Amino acid sequence: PGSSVSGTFGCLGGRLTIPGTGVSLLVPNGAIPQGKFYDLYLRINKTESTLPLSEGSQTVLSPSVTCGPTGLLLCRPVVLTVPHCAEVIAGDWIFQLKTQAHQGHWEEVVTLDEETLNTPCYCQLEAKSCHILLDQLGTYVFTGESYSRSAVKRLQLAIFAPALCTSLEYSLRVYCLEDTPAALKEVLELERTLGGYLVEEPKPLLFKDSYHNLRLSLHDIPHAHWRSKLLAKYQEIPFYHVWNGSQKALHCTFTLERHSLASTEFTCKVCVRQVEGEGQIFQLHTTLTTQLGPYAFKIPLSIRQKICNSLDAPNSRGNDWRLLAQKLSMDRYLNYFATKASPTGVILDLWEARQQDDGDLNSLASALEEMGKSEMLVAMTTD
DSSP states (O other): OTTEEEEEEOTTOEEEEETTTTEEEEEOTTSSOTTOOEEEEEEEOOGGGGGGGOSTTEEEOSOOEEEEOSSOOOSSOEEEEEEOOBOOSSSOOEEEEEEESSTTOEEEEEETTOOOTTOSEEEEEOSSEEEEEESSOEEEEEEEEOOOTTOEEEEEEEEEEESOOOSSEEEEEEEEEESSHHHHHHHHHHHHHHTEEEOSOOEEEEEESSSOOEEEEEEOOOTTTEEEOOSSSOEEEOHHHHHSOOOTTOEEEEEEEESSTTOOEEEEEEEEEETTSOEEEEEEEEEOOEEETTTTOSSOHHHHHHHHHHHSSOOTTSTTHHHHHHHTTOOTTTHHHHTSSOHHHHHHHHHHHHHTTTOOHHHHHHHHHHTTOOHHHHHHHOO
């Protein structure tokens, strides 16, 4: 219900966002035909709906996201942003954007680095998210596959305990989640129903394509007052279950027993690690959606038009939108911008999409300054 949002947009565009997920749809100025208004929606689909894409070497890297309705005319691309859990720079991944024509059926839109002049999207692949320029709306998911020993995904580790405890029985739920805000939001919602609370801030863990399992154990339990109810000294989560994705709230449950209700404080060391890989320690101690244009955008229309007019013109020594794209690290496949009526306009849309996250207006001015462009353009873009 609240994993979907909707809005009405015109040619001035705007932004649709599902709060706490990393998922948003940026509808730029001029994507919607002048004098028209579109009712659009944006939804995250069930974690389990991509299960067929999660097997052996293949993994789902992002939530599956639907934007629509389909069948509306767009004049310029829109930007669909999704978070991902890949470590991108490192070991070899084959990245792919996939689309779902109808329920239970996926096909590739593109495999990254196989782009052609006909590819109807551009995946701007960032460290922790993808900003996907789309020529059309629909259902999309970002996937990655690898046999490389070097390929890494990012996890976040979140531990929950019951807020109310009346028994001698006590339990800790140690979740091993994909590192996206969406994944955390989902588990927080699950635990609200289960009556759990987050005992510590989540912690990162890198998980390697090494075929090694996750191992989880408790240590330094106050034996005088507490005991573990499990025979095994540790628990494991199978490598493929961690690797593949599309699994709702992966966790192990640890079960403890207090001697009496006088014991109202629990302490222990929780270790979560990949065999032959990384590990984390928790030192535990418990007690018993819609913006509209042009205000949705960081660059005023007047300044955007000035930049686009300056940079759209082909430059003999390479000093045009191509160099701006290179400077902003948006140059993995320049020909997607080249076929647009304003290559600069689409680059700026991508920059806008980035600014919802980590950057600053100075990344744009810095780039323009290094390009030797008008100091008036730099003046206009500085922050």
